[PDB]
């Protein structure tokens, strides 16, 4: 499947588990399971196709710092940076989902803007009344970029 976030899924009871077929390799999709969910509400007021997605900054801004800490346990003495999707089509680059009879496409660039070291984020979307989906993020789909760049700043991207 070609998404980025997991809506209405399962939660890792204990803590945060990293699961992949080959962590030493970069081509294989990384699927990190979380414990505490994060609220993501995408409303569609009404351009008319332009929507948004309110997501508390702090919650998200923390559920990447701890996420780095676990990644650092799989990559010794290496920084962990998060950067947006590098895709060529709307379906894969943006957070797409079927919300009450409509497919969305959220420019989720603001979610992955810089390194994380230990208000409300609004994401523009694509496609008359007021629609509202109330899902919760249980996990993340990531994809590491290999190559042994010597800055040792492991860049991660949401994809598959």
């Amino acid at each position: 499947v070609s998404t980025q976030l997991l809506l209405n899924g399962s939660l890792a009871k204990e803590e945060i588990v990293i699961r992949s077929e080959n962590l030493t390799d970069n081509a294989k999709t990384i699927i990190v399971h979380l414990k505490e969910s994060v609220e993501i509400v995408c409303t569609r007021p009404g351009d008319t196709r332009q929507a948004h997605c309110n997501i508390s900054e702090e919650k998200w801004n923390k559920t990447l710092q701890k996420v780095s800490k676990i990644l650092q346990e799989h990559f010794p003495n290496k920084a962990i940076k998060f950067e947006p999707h590098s895709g060529g089509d709307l379906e894969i680059t943006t957070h797409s989902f079927n919300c009450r009879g409509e497919f969305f496409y959220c420019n989720t660039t603001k979610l992955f803007n810089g390194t994380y070291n230990s208000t409300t984020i609004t994401l523009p979307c694509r496609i008359k009344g007021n629609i509202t989906c109330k899902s919760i993020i249980t996990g993340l789909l990531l994809t590491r970029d290999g190559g042994n760049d010597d800055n040792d700043t492991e860049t991660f991207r949401p994809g598959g």
Binding site: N26, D145, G146, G147, N148, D150
Partner: protein, 206 residues
């Protein structure tokens, strides 16, 4: 906007040939291009080597500059190489291309000859400077023009090296000006860089 490669690289048959690629913030891949045929990837993701590619082809990268190393260089390696990188604005950016050449003949310094616009042409209200580079090997040069003492890039046309009967190469570069531009400076100059030496000719209006 391009990633920066050197125009040429030359080594004796069966030696280490290194090609740089400066200006890439993300991972880099490479393409070998031979005349007529289509480009083909030899290295991807900085140092990954796909099947069909000999294990003498390698490479690495350090933050900014990516590298393509070639040991035991033979005749079947002679080709133009182009590095590529992804981008968040232009999507894809390639390097300026490097020309690998195996020395099968002693090196020769290029003979440069610069001609000023002829009285005849100026009558026609046109002005052309003619830089003629002949008898040099290997076949790869860099032509740089200067007006007075500052560089000039607009109005310059330069051929690609053409092998002559003498086994060596020859090129030419023309700086087209208007008689006004030509006479408003006191000296135009043509500098040709080849290997580790540069010849510079300078003419002036009278």
């Amino acid at each position: 906007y391009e990633l920066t490669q050197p125009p040429s690289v030359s080594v004796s048959p069966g030696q280490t040939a290194t090609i740089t690629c400066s200006g890439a913030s993300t991972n880099v891949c490479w393409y070998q291009v031979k005349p007529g045929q289509s480009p083909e990837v030899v290295i991807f993701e900085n140092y990954k080597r796909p099947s069909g590619i000999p294990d003498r082809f390698s490479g690495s990268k350090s933050g900014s500059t990516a590298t393509l190393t070639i040991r035991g260089t033979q005749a079947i390696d002679e080709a133009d190489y182009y590095c590529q990188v992804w981008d968040s604005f232009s999507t894809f950016v390639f390097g300026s291309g490097t020309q690998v050449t195996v020395l099968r003949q002693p090196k020769a310094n290029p003979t440069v000859t610069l001609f000023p616009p002829s009285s005849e042409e100026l009558q026609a209200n046109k002005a052309t400077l003619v830089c003629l580079i002949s008898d040099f090997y290997p076949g790869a040069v860099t032509v740089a023009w200067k007006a007075d003492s500052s560089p000039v890039k607009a109005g310059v046309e330069t051929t690609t090296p053409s092998k002559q009967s003498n086994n060596k190469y020859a090129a030419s570069s023309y700086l087209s000006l208007t008689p006004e531009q030509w006479k408003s400076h006191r000296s135009y100059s043509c500098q040709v860089t080849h290997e580790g030496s540069t010849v510079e000719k300078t003419v002036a209006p009278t």
